[PDB]
Amino acid sequence: DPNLWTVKCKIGEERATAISLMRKFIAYQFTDTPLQIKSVVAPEHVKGYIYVEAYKQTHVKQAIEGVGNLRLGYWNQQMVPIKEMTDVLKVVKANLKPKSWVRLKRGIYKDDIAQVDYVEPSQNTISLKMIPRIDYDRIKAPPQRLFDAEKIRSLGGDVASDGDFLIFEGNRYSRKGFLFKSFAMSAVITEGVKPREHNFQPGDNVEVCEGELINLQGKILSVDGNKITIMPKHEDLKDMLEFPAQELRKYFKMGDHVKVIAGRFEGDTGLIVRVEENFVILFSDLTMHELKVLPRDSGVDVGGQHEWGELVQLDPQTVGVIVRLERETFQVLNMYGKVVTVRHQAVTRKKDNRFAVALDSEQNNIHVKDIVKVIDGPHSGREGEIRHLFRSFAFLHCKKLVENGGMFVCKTRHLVLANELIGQTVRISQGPYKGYIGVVKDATESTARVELHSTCQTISVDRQRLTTV
């Protein structure tokens, strides 16, 4: 049987090389200079070089003569080894739900939270429910805002209304203030959004969830991506076993410190007071406000209308942020910095302006999500993330603050985003240097340094001795 020999080729022009060698084979197959090679292989995904099937290297060299595209493999050839010749012709070929939330990878809608309105059965795209970032073709010759169909009908351009549904500016589809447009599944980020996966790190205590090895707990020695071959050291066991990720879970007796790796709460820490079936409850270190999370890692009140951290209208003039959920009431941090107790129905849910802009103490533009330092007022010295803005008020969050679930309120002006004689030709009119013309480099209340035009020296004299030109 003949063997395969690597011949280096021009990149991106390997298929054309095989076509030219086949034409060269048929053009000289009856002549006195025959191509004694057997086949030519240029694969689909192997880029840069092709393969010649022959019993000899000299047959390869005398067959590729006259081909310029292989001239970097003309002098020497390398044989594909015998066990590896089948590797030449060898060809190889959850995380997303309806009403879940993803993040688009590109565009102005890059990194924005978007709800999955519809999963396409062909698995090409998903319809996404968004909030548009558009200037309504007025500024174009931005923060998120609700789609005003009357405004885009007023401005005109590419607009087509079909009731609440509307097509605009490149087949952008919108309905009832929200966008509903298909975007590719390869173009969206399906995991870690939190408006399978495995995360195990050496040193954590894990439990065996199934098997004859079930209910062993031990600490992680090492980690791999799938079958972790987690090498746990179980209690009272000096031996290392191997477990696949799917067989494990992150256990924890009550009283140990825990971190929230991913979720609405991620970054927060606490001691777990009670562990339930897959449920785990804990108290945060910043605030004693309760938390219930899954073992691998709700946030909404009973009734589903409101959720912690939301902006509410307390009365016609006063806004606040919900900072504690109770069975009949909320605790709300109002815009003045006081916490009030109100019945769930006594406050109205307020539309948050995610695209709000304000000025900080140094006249910088600040926006929601910005990190600011507090430089005046009661919270001076603190640092926080802007969560909401209203008139002269900013609601901030800092996870280190245990009070009010980390929320606090500051005035925007208490925040910050985290001589005449100089150069004037003078004439010394008194003293030992009298009559010299120079230029004032530095000047004070008393004296001034004069670069003398004549000498190579800068000397200082009194301002009472100088007379300008």
Partner 1 sequence: FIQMSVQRIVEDAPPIDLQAEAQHASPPRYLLKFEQIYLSKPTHWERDGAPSPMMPNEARLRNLTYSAPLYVDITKTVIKEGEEQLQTQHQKT
Partner 2 sequence: ALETVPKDLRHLRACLLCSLVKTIDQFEYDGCDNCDAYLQMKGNREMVYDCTSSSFDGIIAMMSPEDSWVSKWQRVSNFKPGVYAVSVTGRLPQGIVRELKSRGVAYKSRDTAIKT
Partner 3 sequence: QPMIYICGECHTENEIKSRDPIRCRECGYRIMYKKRTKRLVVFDAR
Supply the minimum distance, in Å, between the C-beta of residue 42 and partner 2. 6
8, 78 Cβ separation under 8 angstroms: no
Q: Which of 19, 22, 26, 422 binds partner 1 (CB under 8 A)?
A: 26
Nearer to partner 1, 31 or 201 (CB): 31
223, 202 Cβ separation under 8 angstroms: yes
Is residue 437 a contact point for partner 3 (CB under 8 A)?
A: yes
CA distance 240 to 220: 9
Q: Which of 12, 66, 156, 170 binds partner 1 (CB under 8 A)?
A: 66
104, 125 Cβ separation under 8 angstroms: no
Query: Would you state the structure tokens that stand for residue 353, as one six-digit string?
Result: 């302006």
Four-point Cα dihedral 363, 365, 366, 370, nearest 10: -110
Residue type, 45: H
Only one of the segments 22-30, 270-278, 378-386, 445-453 lies at the binding site for partner 1 (rule: CB under 8 A); that segment is 22-30
38, 53 Cβ separation under 8 angstroms: yes
CB neighbours of 226 closer than 8 A, spacing ≥ 6?
198, 244, 245
Supply the minimum distance, in Å, between the C-beta of residue 186 and partner 2. 18
- Find out whether 324 is annotated in a ligand binding site: no
Is residue 107 a contact point for partner 1 (CB under 8 A)?
A: no
Query: Would you state the structure tokens that stand for residue 115, as one six-digit string?
Result: 């709800």
> Binds 66, which of partner 1, partner 3, partner 2, none (CB < 5 to 8 A, cut-off by type)?
partner 1
Residue 356 neighbours by CB distance under 10 Å: 16
Residue 351 neighbours by CB distance under 10 Å: 9
Beta strands at 311-313 and 290-293: parallel, antiparallel or unpaired: unpaired
CB neighbours of 148 closer than 8 A, spacing ≥ 6?
136, 177
Burial class (CB in 10 A: 0-12, 13-18, 19+), 423: exposed
CA distance 130 to 144: 9
Nearer to partner 1, 50 or 407 (CB): 50
Only one of the segments 28-36, 331-339, 352-360, 425-433 lies at the binding site for partner 1 (rule: CB under 8 A); that segment is 28-36
Is residue 24 a contact point for partner 1 (CB under 8 A)?
A: yes
Is residue 34 a contact point for partner 1 (CB under 8 A)?
A: no
> Binds 28, which of partner 2, partner 3, partner 1, none (CB < 5 to 8 A, cut-off by type)?
partner 1
Nearer to partner 2, 9 or 230 (CB): 9
Is residue 65 a contact point for partner 1 (CB under 8 A)?
A: yes
Q: Which of 48, 68, 98, 431 binds partner 1 (CB under 8 A)?
A: 68
CA distances (Å), origin 269, targets 185, 256, 402, 466? 33, 11, 11, 69
| Contact pattern for partner 3 over residues 389 through 428, marking x by CB under 8 A | ------------------------------------x---
Supply the minimum distance, in Å, between the C-beta of residue 26 and partner 1. 5
Supply the minimum distance, in Å, between the C-beta of residue 396 and partner 1. 58
54, 5 Cβ separation under 8 angstroms: yes
Residues lying near partner 2 in the complex (CB under 8 A): 1-2, 15-16, 18-19, 21-23, 25-27, 35, 37-45, 53, 85-86, 89-93
**SS3 (DSSP) at 463:** helix
Q: Which of 28, 165, 279, 336 binds partner 1 (CB under 8 A)?
A: 28
Q: Which of 24, 66, 73 is nearest to 48 (CA)?
A: 73
* CA 382 centroid distance within chain: 26
User: How many chain residues interact with partner 3 (CB under 8 A)?
Assistant: 9
Supply the minimum distance, in Å, between the C-beta of residue 67 and partner 1. 6
> Binds 435, which of partner 2, partner 3, partner 1, none (CB < 5 to 8 A, cut-off by type)?
partner 3
Residues facing residue 332 across a β-bridge? 322, 340
- Region of residue 406 (phi > 0: left; psi between -120 and 50: alpha; otherwise: beta): left
Is residue 380 a contact point for partner 3 (CB under 8 A)?
A: no
Is residue 22 a contact point for partner 1 (CB under 8 A)?
A: no
* CA 351 centroid distance within chain: 25
CA distances (Å), origin 255, targets 16, 283, 324, 349, 419? 69, 10, 24, 37, 66
Supply the minimum distance, in Å, between the C-beta of residue 1 and partner 2. 4
Q: Which of 278, 454, 464, 468 binds partner 3 (CB under 8 A)?
A: 454
Nearer to partner 3, 99 or 441 (CB): 441
Nearer to partner 1, 67 or 417 (CB): 67
- Find out whether 391 is annotated in a ligand binding site: yes
Supply the minimum distance, in Å, between the C-beta of residue 21 and partner 1. 10
> Binds 201, which of partner 3, partner 2, partner 1, none (CB < 5 to 8 A, cut-off by type)?
none
List, as residue ranges, the binding site for DNA.
391
Positions that interact with partner 1 (CB under 8 A): 20, 23-24, 26-31, 65-68
List, as residue ranges, the binding site for RNA.
351
List, as residue ranges, the binding site.
351, 391
